[PDB]
Symmetry: C3
Subunit: 278 residues, 3 copies
């Protein structure tokens, strides 16, 4: 493999995180005060890493951090129930652990933590984070397995109710690649709606990594994936592979949601920077 | 594998079953008159087993027994259309067969019956069982393949419209386990709604058994599964594996649905019997 | 395998196609003028084939042809944005290529084009084809991989909003087979609703072909499949295998949708042409 690959994990990483109310009314996570995003920052790690996150709630209401997929103790589940949220102005340290797969004492196979996951608030608005999530308190988490192929860039598309990334309808987000790039997309759904994520000109494997191991990988290949609230998948694609440059559309294929604004562009450029038709 | 495993099938099993109207308005299946449950009793069998069920309808309206997954002749499909429902007070013997996998004469591969299946009414309220299903006429069916790992206990979570197991909003069901137990979940959806089943602190394989065969199983690992009417999956988890004891929440992650009551507790206890925080 | 298998692709195929406004008000694709259908004709090809489709728009409104899964350049994505639709009375040649799977230069594994795909309009009603798709501008596309088992017949079932193949509620379509026939279903969903496709007495593998490769194929076996707008899968079944002849119901298991009309019959006949109960 001429491509970069993920190393074996086992680091103890540290991370400061904030929750901020944004001037537009939204709420967002950030790694630096004043630099909060919706979606929030991407956290990326290797199976075996441990992550300590000193999370500071800079808001006037309680807020929390809840993650999918990773190992955490109940003290870190981010729920009011388990006394795990954070009061206004407070600071709590959360810990996420990840393990490699392997055989258990009983001969059964323990799955690893690798995958395309995500984190979100669990206590704003309701004890399930309905307000925090609607407001933008969600972000992606990637856990890589030793050997995983690494992309040239990672992009996060979140269908949150009937928006992408909390944007006004019909305003993207667009993003750009050059024909040939190894583009990784993290796709997360939130809210009370169901969607189908469709991408013109490109397809991927409906498995953990979006990539087939080889000739024996039985995973289906698809260009259209159904998604429900708190579902998260990812894939990698070769921008324009076999199809060339262009303004490639991505959208929710729900005809109503398409019409109502859930559309963006994957702008795959030629080596000279141009996009056929423009 | 030092865990118990399912034996080869081939038995001819007999079963008596009833449909009763319950004092609280609902309708339920049972194995003994006066002991009907919503969800109904679990039927569990091995590939190759045959099941003769003498089903007696103790209600004042036609009722039936329709099963997913297993082999049955049209006389046992449980529809009014094919004359295989049951008159009030009547008694009828349904037969379900199961088979092992193996090679067909044409060299193709016939799948076996193994899986996480279910049974429900088909003629109450409408010719599609809408009333019976609404009222509680559904139950789980497990078909095991020789060698399948057996659990310490099995639990059935049914998302029926916007309830769990037909319970009142925000009333569980909760279950208890001890850190270390092998806990099997049978998850069934019924009605006119779509859901995502989420479970804190735990994850499983999105394949037939919920378990990875080993290092080569390409099955994706998830903690959030989308489900539609009459969908049915299952899985096993090691209670608290890598995360400890606690009041672990499970719910539909549809923000509206969890707000409206669709939440339960998976109480994983320390060996002293306690649950962190209480 | 003593059943017919798909050959290696590589042909350059040519195809003429029309969009016709039908007298009942719908819009359909056809291969011959005056012989348009909803669903439109089945296009079927082998990995490596190229297909040039001279598509003539016979209607009073712009219309287009957009395909899932296969390779196409941006000049052929069928969108207004990319100047790829067809004006009334106009004629445009779209091109679809397909490729075999194989190893990329970087050691990674490029998936082939094989699958159960589909094509539909992208510019009638809205820039997402909401009108065309509503009216019936959709059809199936199969891309076979060398060695794929071929069926005795293929049938296409489209859940379009709350109809099957744009039919009036409770009017089928029905299909006939003989016990033993190898029957292929192409299942496609369009519109703004979500569905579960259920079939009595039969089951299939939730992978690309609906078939297990053999004893090592980890794919789940199911009889009930969730589906969203622009989703497309297919499978093969042996009509009546292990269950006998009969009037086998297929429907959307959404209790509301089946009550509301989304039901059809798979009439599996005895060798004497009869159907148990009639
Ligand atoms: Cu939660
Ligand atoms: Cu959508
Ligand atoms: Cu498309
Ligand atoms: Cu969540
Ligand atoms: Cu049915
Ligand atoms: Cu729900
Ligand atoms: Cu969670
Ligand atoms: Cu059913
Ligand atoms: Cu599109
Ligand atoms: Cu439906
Ligand atoms: Cu059924
Ligand atoms: Cu489409
Ligand atoms: O599309
Ligand atoms: O959650
Ligand atoms: O059914």
């Amino acid at each position: 493999i001429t491509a970069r690959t993920a190393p074996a994990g086992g680091e103890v990483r540290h991370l400061k995180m904030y929750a901020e109310k944004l001037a537009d009314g939204q709420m967002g996570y950030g790694f630096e005060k004043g630099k909060a995003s919706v979606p929030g920052p991407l956290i990326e790690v290797n199976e075996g890493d441990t992550l300590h996150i000193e999370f500071t709630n800079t808001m006037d209401v309680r807020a929390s951090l809840h993650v999918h997929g990773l190992d955490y103790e109940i003290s870190s589940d981010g729920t009011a129930m388990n006394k795990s949220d954070v009061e206004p102005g407070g600071t709590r340290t959360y810990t996420w652990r990840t393990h490699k797969p392997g055989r258990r004492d009983d001969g059964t196979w323990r799955p690893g933590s690798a995958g395309y996951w995500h984190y979100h608030d669990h206590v704003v608005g309701t004890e399930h984070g309905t307000g925090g999530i609607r407001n933008g308190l969600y972000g992606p988490v990637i856990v890589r397995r030793k050997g995983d192929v690494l992309p040239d860039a990672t992009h996060t598309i979140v269908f949150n109710d009937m928006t992408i990334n909390n944007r006004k309808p019909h305003t993207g987000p667009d993003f750009e690649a050059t024909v040939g790039d190894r583009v990784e997309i993290v796709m997360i759904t939130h809210g009370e709606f169901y969607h189908t994520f469709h991408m013109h000109g490109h397809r991927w494997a409906d498995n953990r990594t979006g990539i087939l191991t080889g000739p024996d990988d039985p995973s289906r290949v698809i260009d259209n994936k159904i998604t429900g609230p708190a579902d998260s998948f990812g894939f990698q694609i070769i921008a324009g592979e076999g199809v060339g440059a262009g303004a490639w559309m991505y959208h929710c294929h729900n005809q109503f949601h398409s019409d109502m604004g859930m559309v963006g562009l994957f702008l795959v450029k030629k080596p000279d920077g141009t996009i056929p038709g423009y």
